[PDB]
PDB file of C-alpha atoms in Angstrom:
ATOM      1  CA  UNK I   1      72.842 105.887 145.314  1.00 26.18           C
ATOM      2  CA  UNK I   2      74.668 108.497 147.486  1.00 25.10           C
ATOM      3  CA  UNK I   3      73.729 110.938 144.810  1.00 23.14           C
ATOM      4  CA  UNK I   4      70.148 109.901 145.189  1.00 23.39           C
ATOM      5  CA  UNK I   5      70.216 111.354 149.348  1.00 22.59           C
ATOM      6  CA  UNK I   6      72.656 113.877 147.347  1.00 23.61           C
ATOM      7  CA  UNK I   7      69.499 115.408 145.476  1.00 22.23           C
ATOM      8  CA  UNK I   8      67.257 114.846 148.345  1.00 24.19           C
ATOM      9  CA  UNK I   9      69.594 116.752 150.763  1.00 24.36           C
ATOM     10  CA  UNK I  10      69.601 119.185 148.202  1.00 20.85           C
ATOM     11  CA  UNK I  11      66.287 119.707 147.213  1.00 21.73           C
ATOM     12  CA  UNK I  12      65.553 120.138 151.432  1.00 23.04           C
ATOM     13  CA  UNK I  13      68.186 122.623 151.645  1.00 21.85           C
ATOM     14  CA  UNK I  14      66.222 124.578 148.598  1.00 18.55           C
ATOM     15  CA  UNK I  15      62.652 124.098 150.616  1.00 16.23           C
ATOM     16  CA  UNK I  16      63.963 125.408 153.692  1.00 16.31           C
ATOM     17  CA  UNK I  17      65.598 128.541 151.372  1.00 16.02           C
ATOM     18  CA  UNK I  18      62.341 129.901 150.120  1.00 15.18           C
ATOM     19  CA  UNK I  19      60.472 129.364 153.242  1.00 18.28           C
ATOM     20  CA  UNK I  20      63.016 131.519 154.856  1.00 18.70           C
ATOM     21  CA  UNK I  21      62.937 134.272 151.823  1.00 18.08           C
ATOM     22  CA  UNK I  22      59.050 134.439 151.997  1.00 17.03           C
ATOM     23  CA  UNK I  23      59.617 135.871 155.627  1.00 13.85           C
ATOM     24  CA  UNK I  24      61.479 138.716 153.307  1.00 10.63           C
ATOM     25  CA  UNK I  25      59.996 139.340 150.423  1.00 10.30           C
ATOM     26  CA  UNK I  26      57.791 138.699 148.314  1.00  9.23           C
ATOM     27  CA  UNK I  27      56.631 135.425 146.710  1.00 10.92           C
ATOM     28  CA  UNK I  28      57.496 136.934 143.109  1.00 10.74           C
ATOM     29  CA  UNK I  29      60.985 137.510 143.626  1.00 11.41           C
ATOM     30  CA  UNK I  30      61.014 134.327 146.172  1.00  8.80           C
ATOM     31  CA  UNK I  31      60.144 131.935 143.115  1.00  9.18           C
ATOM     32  CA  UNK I  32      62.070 133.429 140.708  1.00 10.77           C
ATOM     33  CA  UNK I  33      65.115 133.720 142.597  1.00 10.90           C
ATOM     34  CA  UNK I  34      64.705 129.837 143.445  1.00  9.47           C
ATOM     35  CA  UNK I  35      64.068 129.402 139.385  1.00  9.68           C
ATOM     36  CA  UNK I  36      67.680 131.650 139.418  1.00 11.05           C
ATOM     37  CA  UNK I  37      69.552 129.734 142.084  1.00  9.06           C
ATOM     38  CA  UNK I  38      67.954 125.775 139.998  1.00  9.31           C
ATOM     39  CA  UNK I  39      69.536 127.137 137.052  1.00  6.70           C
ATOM     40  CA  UNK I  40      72.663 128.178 138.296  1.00  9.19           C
ATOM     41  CA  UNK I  41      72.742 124.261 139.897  1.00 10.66           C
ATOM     42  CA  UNK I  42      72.033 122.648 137.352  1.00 10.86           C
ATOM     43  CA  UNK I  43      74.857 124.247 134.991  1.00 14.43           C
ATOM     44  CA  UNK I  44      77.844 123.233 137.797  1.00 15.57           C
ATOM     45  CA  UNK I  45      76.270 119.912 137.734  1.00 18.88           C
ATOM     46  CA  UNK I  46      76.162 119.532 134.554  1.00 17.65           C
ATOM     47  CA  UNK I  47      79.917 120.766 133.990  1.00 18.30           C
ATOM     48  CA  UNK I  48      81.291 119.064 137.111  1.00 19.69           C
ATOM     49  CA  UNK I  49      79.738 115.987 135.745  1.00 20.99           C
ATOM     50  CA  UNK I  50      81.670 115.830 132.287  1.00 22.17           C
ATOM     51  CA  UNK I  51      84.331 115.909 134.228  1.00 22.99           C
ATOM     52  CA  UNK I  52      85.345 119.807 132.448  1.00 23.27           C
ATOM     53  CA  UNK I  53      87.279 122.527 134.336  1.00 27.46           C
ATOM     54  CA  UNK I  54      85.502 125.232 132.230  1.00 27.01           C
ATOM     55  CA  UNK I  55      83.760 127.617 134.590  1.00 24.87           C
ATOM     56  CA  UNK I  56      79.716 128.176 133.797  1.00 25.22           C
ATOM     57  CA  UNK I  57      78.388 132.091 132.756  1.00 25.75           C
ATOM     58  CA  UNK I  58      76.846 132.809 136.135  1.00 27.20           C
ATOM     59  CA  UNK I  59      74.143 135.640 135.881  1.00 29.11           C
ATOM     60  CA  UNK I  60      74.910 138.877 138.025  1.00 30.68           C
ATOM     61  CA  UNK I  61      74.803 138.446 141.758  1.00 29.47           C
ATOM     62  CA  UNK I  62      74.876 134.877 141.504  1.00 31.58           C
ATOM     63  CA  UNK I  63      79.157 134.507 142.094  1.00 33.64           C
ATOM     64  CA  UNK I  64      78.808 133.851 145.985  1.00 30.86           C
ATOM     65  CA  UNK I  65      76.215 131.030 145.447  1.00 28.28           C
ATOM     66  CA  UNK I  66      79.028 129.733 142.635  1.00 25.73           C
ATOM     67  CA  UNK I  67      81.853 129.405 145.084  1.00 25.79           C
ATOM     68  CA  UNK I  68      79.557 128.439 147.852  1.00 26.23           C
ATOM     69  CA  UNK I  69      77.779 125.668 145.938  1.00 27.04           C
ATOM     70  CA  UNK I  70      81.420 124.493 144.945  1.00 30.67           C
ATOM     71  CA  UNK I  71      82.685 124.045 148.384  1.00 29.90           C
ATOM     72  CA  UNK I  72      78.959 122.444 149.367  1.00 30.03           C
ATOM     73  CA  UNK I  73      78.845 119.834 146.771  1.00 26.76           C
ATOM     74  CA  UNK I  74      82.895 119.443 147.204  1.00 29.22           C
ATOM     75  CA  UNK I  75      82.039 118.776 151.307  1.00 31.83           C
ATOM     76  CA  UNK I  76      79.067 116.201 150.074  1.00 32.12           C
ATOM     77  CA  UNK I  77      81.553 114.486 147.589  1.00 30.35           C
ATOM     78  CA  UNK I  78      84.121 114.030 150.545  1.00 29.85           C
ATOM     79  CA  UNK I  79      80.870 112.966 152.546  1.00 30.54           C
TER      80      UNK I  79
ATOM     81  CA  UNK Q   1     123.392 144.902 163.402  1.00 29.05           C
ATOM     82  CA  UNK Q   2     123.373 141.364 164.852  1.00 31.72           C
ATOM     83  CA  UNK Q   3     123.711 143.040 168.427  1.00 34.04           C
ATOM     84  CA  UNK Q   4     120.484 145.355 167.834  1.00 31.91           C
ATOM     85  CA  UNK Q   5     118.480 142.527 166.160  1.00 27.80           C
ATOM     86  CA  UNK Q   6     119.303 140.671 168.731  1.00 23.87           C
ATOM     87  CA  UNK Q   7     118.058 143.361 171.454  1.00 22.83           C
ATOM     88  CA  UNK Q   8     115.070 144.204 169.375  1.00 23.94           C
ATOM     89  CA  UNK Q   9     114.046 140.309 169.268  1.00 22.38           C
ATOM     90  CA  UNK Q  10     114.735 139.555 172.908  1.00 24.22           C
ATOM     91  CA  UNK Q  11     112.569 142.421 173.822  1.00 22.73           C
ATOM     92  CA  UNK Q  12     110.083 141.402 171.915  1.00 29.06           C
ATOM     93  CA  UNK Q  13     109.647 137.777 172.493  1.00 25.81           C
ATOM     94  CA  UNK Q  14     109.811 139.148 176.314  1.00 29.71           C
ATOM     95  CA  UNK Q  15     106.997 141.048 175.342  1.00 26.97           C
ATOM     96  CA  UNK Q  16     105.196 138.434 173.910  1.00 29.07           C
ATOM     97  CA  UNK Q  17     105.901 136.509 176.671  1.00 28.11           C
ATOM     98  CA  UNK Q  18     104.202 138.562 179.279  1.00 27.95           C
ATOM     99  CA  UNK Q  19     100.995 139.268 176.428  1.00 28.94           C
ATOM    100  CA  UNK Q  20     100.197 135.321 176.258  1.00 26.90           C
ATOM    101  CA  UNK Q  21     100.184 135.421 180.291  1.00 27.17           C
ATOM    102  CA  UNK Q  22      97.570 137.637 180.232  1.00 28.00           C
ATOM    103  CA  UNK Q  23      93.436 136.759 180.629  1.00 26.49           C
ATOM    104  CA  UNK Q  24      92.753 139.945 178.683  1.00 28.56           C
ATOM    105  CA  UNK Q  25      94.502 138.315 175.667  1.00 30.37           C
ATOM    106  CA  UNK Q  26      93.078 134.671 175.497  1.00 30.78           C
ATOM    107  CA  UNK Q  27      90.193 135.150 175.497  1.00 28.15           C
ATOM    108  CA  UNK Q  28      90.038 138.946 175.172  1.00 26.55           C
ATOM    109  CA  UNK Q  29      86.866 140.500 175.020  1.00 26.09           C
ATOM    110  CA  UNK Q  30      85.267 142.689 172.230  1.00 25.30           C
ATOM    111  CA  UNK Q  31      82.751 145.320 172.713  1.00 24.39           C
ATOM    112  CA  UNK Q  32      79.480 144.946 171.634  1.00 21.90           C
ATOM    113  CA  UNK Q  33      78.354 146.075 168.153  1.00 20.50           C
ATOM    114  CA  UNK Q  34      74.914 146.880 166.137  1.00 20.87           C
ATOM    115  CA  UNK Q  35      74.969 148.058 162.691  1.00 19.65           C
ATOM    116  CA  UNK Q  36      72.795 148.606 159.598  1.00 14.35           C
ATOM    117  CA  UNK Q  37      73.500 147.130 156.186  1.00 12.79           C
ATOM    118  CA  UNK Q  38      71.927 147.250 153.022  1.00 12.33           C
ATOM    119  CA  UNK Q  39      73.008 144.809 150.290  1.00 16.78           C
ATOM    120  CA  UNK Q  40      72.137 144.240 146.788  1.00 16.58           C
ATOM    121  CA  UNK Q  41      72.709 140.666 145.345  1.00 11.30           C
ATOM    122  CA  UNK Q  42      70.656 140.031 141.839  1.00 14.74           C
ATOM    123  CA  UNK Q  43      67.195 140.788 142.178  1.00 17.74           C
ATOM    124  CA  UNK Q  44      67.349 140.726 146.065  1.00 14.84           C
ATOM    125  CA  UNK Q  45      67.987 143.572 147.666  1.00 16.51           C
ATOM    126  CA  UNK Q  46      68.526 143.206 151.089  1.00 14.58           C
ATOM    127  CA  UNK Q  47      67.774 145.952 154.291  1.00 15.36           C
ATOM    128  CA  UNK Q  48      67.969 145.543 157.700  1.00 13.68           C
ATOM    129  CA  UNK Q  49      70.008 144.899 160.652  1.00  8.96           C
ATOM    130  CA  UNK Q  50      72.386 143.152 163.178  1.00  7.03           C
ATOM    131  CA  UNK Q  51      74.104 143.088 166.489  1.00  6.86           C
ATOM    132  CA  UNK Q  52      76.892 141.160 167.678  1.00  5.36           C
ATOM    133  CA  UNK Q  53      77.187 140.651 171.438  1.00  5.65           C
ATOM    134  CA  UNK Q  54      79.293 138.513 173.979  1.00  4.98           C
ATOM    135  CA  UNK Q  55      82.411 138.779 170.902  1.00  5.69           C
ATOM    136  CA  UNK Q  56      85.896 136.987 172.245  1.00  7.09           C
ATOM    137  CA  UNK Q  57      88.394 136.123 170.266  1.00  9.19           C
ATOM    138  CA  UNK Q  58      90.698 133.321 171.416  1.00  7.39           C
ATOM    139  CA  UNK Q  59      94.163 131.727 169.621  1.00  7.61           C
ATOM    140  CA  UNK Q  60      96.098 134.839 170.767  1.00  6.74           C
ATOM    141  CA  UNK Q  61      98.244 133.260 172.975  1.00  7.13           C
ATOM    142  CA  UNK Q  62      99.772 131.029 170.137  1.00  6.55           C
ATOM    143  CA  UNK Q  63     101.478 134.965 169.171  1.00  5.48           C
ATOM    144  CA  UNK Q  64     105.094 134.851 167.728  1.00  4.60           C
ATOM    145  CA  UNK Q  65     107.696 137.072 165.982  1.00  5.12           C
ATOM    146  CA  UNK Q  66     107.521 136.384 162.069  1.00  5.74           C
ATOM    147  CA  UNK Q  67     111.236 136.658 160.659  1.00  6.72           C
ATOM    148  CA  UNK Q  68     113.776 138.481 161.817  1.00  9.28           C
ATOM    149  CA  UNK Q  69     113.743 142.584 163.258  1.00  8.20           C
ATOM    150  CA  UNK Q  70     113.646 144.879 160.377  1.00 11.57           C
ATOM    151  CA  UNK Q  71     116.289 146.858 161.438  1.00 12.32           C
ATOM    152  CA  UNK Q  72     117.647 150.573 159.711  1.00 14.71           C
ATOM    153  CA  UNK Q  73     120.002 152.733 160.689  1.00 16.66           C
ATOM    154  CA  UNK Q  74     118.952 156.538 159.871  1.00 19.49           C
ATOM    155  CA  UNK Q  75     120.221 159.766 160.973  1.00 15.67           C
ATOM    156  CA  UNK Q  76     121.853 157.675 163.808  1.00 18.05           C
ATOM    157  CA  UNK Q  77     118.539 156.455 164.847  1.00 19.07           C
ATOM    158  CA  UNK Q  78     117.633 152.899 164.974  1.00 18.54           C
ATOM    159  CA  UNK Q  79     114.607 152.194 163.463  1.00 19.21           C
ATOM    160  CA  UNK Q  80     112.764 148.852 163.344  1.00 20.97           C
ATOM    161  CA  UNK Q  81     109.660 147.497 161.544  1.00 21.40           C
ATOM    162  CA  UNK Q  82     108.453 144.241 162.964  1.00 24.13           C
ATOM    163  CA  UNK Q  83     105.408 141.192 162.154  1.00 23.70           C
ATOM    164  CA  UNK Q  84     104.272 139.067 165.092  1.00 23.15           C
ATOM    165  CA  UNK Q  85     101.776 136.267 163.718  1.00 25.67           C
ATOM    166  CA  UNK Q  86      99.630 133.816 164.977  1.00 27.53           C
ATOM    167  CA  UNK Q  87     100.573 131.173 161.973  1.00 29.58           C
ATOM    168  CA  UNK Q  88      99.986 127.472 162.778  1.00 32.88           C
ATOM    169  CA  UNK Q  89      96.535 128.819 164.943  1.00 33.39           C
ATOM    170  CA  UNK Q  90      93.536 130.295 163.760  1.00 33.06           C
ATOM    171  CA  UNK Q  91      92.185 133.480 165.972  1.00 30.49           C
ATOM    172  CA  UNK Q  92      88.605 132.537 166.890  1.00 26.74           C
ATOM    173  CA  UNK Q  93      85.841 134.517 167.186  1.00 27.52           C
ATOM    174  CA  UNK Q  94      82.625 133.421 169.357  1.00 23.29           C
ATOM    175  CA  UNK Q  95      79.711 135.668 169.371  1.00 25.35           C
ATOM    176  CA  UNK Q  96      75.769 136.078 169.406  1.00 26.14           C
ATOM    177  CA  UNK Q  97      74.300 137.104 166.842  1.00 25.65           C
ATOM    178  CA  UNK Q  98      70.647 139.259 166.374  1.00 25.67           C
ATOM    179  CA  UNK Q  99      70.049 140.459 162.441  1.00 23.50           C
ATOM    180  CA  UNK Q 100      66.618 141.302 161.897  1.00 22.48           C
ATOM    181  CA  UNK Q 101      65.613 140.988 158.000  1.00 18.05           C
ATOM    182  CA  UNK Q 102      61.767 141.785 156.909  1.00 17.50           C
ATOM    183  CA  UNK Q 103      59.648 140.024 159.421  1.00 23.20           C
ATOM    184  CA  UNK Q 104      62.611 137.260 160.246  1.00 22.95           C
ATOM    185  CA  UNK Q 105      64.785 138.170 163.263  1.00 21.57           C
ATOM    186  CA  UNK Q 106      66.670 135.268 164.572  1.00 21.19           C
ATOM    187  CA  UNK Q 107      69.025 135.210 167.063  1.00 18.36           C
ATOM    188  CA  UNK Q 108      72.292 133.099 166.050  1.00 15.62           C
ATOM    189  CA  UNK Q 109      75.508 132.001 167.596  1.00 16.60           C
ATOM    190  CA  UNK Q 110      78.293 132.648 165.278  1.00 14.17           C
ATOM    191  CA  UNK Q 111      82.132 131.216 165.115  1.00 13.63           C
ATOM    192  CA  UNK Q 112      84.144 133.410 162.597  1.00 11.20           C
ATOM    193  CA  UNK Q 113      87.753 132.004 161.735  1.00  8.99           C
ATOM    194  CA  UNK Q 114      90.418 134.626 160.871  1.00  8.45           C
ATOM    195  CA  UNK Q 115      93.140 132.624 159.477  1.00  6.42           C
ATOM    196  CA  UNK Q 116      97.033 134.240 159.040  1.00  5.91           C
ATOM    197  CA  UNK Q 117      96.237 137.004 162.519  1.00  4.04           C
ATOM    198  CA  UNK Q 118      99.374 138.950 162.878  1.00  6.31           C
ATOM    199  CA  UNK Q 119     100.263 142.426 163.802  1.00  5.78           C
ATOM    200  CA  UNK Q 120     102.668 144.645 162.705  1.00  7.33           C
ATOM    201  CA  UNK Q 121     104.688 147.019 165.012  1.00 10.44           C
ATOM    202  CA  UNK Q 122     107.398 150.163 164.424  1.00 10.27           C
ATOM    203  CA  UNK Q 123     109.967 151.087 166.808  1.00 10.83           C
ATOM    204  CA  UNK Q 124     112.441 154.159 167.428  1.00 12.25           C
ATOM    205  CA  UNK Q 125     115.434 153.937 169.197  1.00 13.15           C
ATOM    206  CA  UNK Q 126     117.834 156.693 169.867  1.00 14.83           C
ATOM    207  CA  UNK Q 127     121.164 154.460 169.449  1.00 14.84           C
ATOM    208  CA  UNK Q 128     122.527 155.073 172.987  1.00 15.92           C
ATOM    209  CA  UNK Q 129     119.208 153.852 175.291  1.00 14.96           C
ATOM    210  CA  UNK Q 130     115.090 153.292 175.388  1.00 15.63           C
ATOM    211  CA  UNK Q 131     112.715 151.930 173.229  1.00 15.68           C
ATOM    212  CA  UNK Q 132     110.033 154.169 172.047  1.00 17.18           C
ATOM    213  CA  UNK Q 133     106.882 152.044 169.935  1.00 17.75           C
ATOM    214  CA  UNK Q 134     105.499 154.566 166.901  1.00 13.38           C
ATOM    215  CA  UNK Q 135     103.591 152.713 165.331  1.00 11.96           C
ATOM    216  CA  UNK Q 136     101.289 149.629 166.081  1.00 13.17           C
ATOM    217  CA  UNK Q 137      98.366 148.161 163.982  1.00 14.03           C
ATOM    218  CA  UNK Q 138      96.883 144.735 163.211  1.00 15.01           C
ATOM    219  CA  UNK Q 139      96.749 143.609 159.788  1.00 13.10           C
ATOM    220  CA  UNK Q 140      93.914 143.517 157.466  1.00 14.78           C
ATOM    221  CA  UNK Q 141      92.772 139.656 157.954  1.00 11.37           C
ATOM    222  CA  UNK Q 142      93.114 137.761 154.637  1.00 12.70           C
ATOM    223  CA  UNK Q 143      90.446 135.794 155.528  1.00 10.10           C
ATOM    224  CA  UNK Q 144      86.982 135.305 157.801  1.00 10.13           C
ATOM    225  CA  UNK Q 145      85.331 132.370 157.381  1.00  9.32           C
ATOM    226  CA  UNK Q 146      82.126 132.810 158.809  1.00 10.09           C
ATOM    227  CA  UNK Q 147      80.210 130.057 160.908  1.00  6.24           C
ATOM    228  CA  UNK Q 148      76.351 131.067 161.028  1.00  3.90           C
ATOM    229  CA  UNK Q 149      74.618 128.674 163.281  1.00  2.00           C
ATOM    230  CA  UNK Q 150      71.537 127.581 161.615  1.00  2.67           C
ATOM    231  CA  UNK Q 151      71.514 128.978 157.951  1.00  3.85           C
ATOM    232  CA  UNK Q 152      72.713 126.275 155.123  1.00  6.93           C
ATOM    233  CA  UNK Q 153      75.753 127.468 153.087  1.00  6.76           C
ATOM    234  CA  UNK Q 154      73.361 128.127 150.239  1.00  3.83           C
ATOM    235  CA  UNK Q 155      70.905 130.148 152.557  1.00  2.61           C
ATOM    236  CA  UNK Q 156      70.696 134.304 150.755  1.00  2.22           C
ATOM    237  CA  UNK Q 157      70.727 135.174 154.167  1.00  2.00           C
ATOM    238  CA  UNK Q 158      74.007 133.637 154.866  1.00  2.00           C
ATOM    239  CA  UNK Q 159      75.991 135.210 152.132  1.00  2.00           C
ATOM    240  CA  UNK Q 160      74.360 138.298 153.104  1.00  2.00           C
ATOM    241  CA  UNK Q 161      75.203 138.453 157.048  1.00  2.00           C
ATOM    242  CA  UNK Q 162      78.391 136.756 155.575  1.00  2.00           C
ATOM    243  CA  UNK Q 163      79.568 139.427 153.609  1.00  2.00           C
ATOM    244  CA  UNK Q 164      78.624 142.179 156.118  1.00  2.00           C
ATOM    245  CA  UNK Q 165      79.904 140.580 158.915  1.00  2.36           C
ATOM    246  CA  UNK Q 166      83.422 140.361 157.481  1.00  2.00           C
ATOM    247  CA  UNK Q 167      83.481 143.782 156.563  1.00  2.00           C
ATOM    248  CA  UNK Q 168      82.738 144.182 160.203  1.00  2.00           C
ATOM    249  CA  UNK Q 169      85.594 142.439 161.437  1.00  2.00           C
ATOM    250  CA  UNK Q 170      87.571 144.405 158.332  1.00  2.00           C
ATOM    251  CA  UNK Q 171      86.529 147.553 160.302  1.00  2.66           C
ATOM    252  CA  UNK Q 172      85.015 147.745 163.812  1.00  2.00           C
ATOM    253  CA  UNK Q 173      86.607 144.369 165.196  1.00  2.00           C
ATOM    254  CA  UNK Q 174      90.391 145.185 163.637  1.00  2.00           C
ATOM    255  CA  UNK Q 175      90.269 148.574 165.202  1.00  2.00           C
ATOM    256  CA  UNK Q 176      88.970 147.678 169.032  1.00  2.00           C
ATOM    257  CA  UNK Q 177      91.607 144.428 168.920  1.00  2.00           C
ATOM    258  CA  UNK Q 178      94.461 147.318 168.545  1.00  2.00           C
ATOM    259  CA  UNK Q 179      92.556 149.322 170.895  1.00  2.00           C
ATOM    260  CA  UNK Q 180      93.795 145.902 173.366  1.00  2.00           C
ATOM    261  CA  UNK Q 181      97.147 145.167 172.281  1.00  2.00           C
ATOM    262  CA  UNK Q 182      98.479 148.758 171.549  1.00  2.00           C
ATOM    263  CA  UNK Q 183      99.101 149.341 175.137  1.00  2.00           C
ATOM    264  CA  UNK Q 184     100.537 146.208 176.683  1.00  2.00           C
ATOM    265  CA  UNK Q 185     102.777 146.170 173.544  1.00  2.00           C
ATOM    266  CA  UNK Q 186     103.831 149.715 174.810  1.00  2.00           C
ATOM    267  CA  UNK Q 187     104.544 148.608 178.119  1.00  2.00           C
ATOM    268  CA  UNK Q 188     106.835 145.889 177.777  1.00  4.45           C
ATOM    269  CA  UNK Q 189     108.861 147.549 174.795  1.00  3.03           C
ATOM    270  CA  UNK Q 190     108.821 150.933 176.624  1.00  2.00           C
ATOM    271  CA  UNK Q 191     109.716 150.073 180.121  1.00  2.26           C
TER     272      UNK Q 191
END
């Protein structure tokens, strides 16, 4: 349903994100910093969805995408 | 007390007054910056650079006194610490954008939202006459939420230009708003 266009949006948002970082880098660390960033997802998606408070072990570097990814999927729950 | 409070506060709502009729104020111009930045997040390690042009800030004009004058009596000197805020408004910043990363250099406008702008001012009065300003700064912003026309929230690239852009307002844009309101301050307490 609206988490259907939810993934979708999602998965765009991701496409345009390593088209961008291949302008930057190079396709090594571009892939495995999107393999980073679809880990770190899918643990807050997994927690959010058992309805827990617990935060998720985020790897080093990654605590700005945390917050940010909370107040993104908070904004698309609103939307 | 009461009486010197009350002196202190009329003067400075006076002052106020006559800031928030000024075009300098709202919208007041900011010069033009360019910096470098390097920044390490994980295994990216960004390097490159930015410059901010066309900056104004606006939502200065919404500037009142926070609380009553801090008022002391020392050595029979009056001496006064005071806040004037901008709580209830959010001070605006509009600018352009250029950061240049690897082969990407786009060229962004920007709207970054200081929320809780106020300034703090200190005072010395000899007890008999005149009002002489010591000290003037404005205060570290708690926060600068950062509006980066076409990256996603998500985008490396925002939390990058994000992070230094904030420090940038911590620094270079703090500094050149005092630059503004030092004086005018000084002129309507002093005269």
């Amino acid at each position: 349903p609206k988490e259907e266009k939810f993934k979708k949006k999602l998965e765009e948002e991701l496409k345009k994100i390593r088209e961008r970082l291949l302008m930057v880098f190079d396709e090594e660390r571009v892939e495995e910093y999107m393999k980073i960033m679809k880990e770190v997802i899918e643990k807050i998606l997994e927690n959010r969805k058992k309805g827990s408070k617990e935060k998720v072990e985020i790897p080093p570097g990654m605590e700005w995408f945390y917050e940010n990814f909370l107040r993104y999927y908070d904004y698309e729950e609103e939307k | 007390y009461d009486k010197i409070t009350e002196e202190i506060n009329k003067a400075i709502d006076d002052a106020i007054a006559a800031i928030e009729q000024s075009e300098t104020i709202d919208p007041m111009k900011v010069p033009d910056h360019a910096d470098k930045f390097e920044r390490h997040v994980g295994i990216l390690d960004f390097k490159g650079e930015l410059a901010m042009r066309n900056i104004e800030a606006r939502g200065l004009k919404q500037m009142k006194r926070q609380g009553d004058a801090n008022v002391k009596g020392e050595e029979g000197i009056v001496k006064a610490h005071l806040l004037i805020g901008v709580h209830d408004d959010i001070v605006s910043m509009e600018y352009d954008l250029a950061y240049k990363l690897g082969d990407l250099h786009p060229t962004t406008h920007v709207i970054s939202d200081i929320q809780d702008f106020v300034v703090a001012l200190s005072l010395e009065i000899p007890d008999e006459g005149n009002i002489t300003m010591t000290s003037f700064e404005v205060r570290q912003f708690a926060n600068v939420v950062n509006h980066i026309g076409g990256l996603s929230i998500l985008d490396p690239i925002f939390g990058v230009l994000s992070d230094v852009l904030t420090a940038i307002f911590q620094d270079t844009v703090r500094k050149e708003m005092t630059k503004v309101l030092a004086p005018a301050f000084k002129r309507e307490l002093e005269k």
